[PDB]
Amino acid sequence: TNPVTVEVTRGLLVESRHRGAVAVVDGDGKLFFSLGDIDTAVFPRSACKAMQALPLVESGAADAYGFGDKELALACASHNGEEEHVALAASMLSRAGRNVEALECGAHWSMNQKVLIQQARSLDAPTALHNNCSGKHAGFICACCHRDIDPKGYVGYEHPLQVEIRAVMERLTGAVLGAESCGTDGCSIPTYAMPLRNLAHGFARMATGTGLEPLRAKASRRLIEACMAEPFYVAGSGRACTKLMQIAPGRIFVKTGAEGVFCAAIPEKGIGISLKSEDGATRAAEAMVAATLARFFETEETVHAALMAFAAMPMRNWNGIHVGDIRATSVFSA
Amino acid sequence: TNPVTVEVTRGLLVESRHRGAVAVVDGDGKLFFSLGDIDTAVFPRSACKAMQALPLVESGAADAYGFGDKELALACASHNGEEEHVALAASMLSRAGRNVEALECGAHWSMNQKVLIQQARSLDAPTALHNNCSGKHAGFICACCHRDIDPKGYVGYEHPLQVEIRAVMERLTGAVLGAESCGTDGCSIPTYAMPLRNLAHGFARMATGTGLEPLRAKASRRLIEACMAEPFYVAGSGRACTKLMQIAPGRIFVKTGAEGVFCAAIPEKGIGISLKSEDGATRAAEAMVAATLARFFETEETVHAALMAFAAMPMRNWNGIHVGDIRATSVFSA
Ligand SMILES: [Cl-]
Ligand SMILES: [Cl-]
Ligand SMILES: [Zn+2]
Ligand SMILES: [Zn+2]
To answer: CB distance B323–A185 less than 8 Å?
Structure first.
């Protein structure tokens, strides 16, 4: 069973509790730190978008369509569907001769409340461009068009692009990705459950190049640097991913996934991080990733304090009164 | 530990898991069914609104202000902030010569996405009337004004109304309510943590009159019947509380609370129910309350099937593809 990783307090009592697992692995596969079950297969969901963006870069598509750090960050992004994000996704599809009609991810309203209010006020309905995965899907469509592969059905298990993605993520993680570990993701593409140990190892390899072909090392490093250089484009206004990567500019990589996943890397320390809140709560995964990062910056007061501000947070009610805290437990400092 | 009460699946695997506690008690305090820890103090939050509506009824205020089942349901309600709910809260305050400016609960946008889209398109900003607790607070203000008590500060621990509420909830539940069990609620009023056993017992007494003074029995029955007669006003469009009380009209009482609480009653069976998802997820608490109710309707095939449809539900992605299920575990049928 997984330890209690996060507590939610009200008055003088714990009101709710989150259990979870955490794997921290270096480029060589060495375990630096672990909580709970890092050996049972868990769906990474959107947390592994940077891995799925390798076809876009490695194929030459990114360079052929003139993509910079903003486009690669958006390809790696679970974004808010702000105008900047929608404009860039449309720009990406346009350079490959496509538009919104080529996306197969569907439409949804922003999962940032303030952006949803803006969307609702200016649209009858969101489009597939507003989908948090529209950057990744435009990356997929660009990767296909550059290689004269028909993008139609790019979301399906048997499409050449999804065949390629299974191979790429097996090479990074050492985990086998197949039908028995496969589910359908939010955006209708395959998501493959794998141990947290493997997922963390894979990010440690993307961060360091350890055990990768040089082109894959270079593409991997380029995607990780793009996310850290353009953190707004990975998520957006009011988002943990964006704010966490603004604490130590260029030094911390993070990516949220649906159902309480986080992947992260500290390239200068050669470490990859993956974690799962067992109940699937985003708030627990946010506290956990900040507290896990904090272990590696205990000699930098300002960075440690900033990270602990996410590990342990005041909650305010509708009048803005402090009612309690979300707080990572003492297992992250043991 | 608390047992695994709910699983969330994707493909052929459990993606996330919820642990929880459940107390089912009769009018006399006899335990009919239990899971996990029913003896540790948990915040009922909004789940005990019917208890907090007793001053409104017992004072004479409800009768003096001509409140029927719709107003009492709204006094007991965590509503969506739909125009019907807002209009009724404004009508309730108006009977005492009051309006939105007398509410101290604060404003918030709907936590129902469809209502939020409607709110965003029709309002610059929500008001305190849009607050899910605006009915309860209008009841509180009416209770004060009928007895010539100043409603100003009615949310404060030391206000005569909150003194009264501590007395009422102690007598129903047999739990001691004071500062050590006290936190601030979403709506800035006190919320008191108590064991689930006590909370369930309290609803069993409201449902049966067992061990209550006649006026309290009658006020208790009237609140429970109003919620069951006007279930839209307890919650609203697309809400578990509303839909669960439409399965067997007049026979099932349910009330959700923030952080994965549910209280319920089946008056004709003399049972009170309280439960807690340990992690605080609403989706887990909804599955749990449906599966717990289902145990008591195993000889009514139509009612059992309708309840099981809430205990075990398909989840669909943005394209409407079935990706997995939320399902109460087999501990609810053991
Ligand atoms: Cl989904
Ligand atoms: Cl009594
Ligand atoms: Zn996706
Ligand atoms: Zn309230």
So the answer is: yes
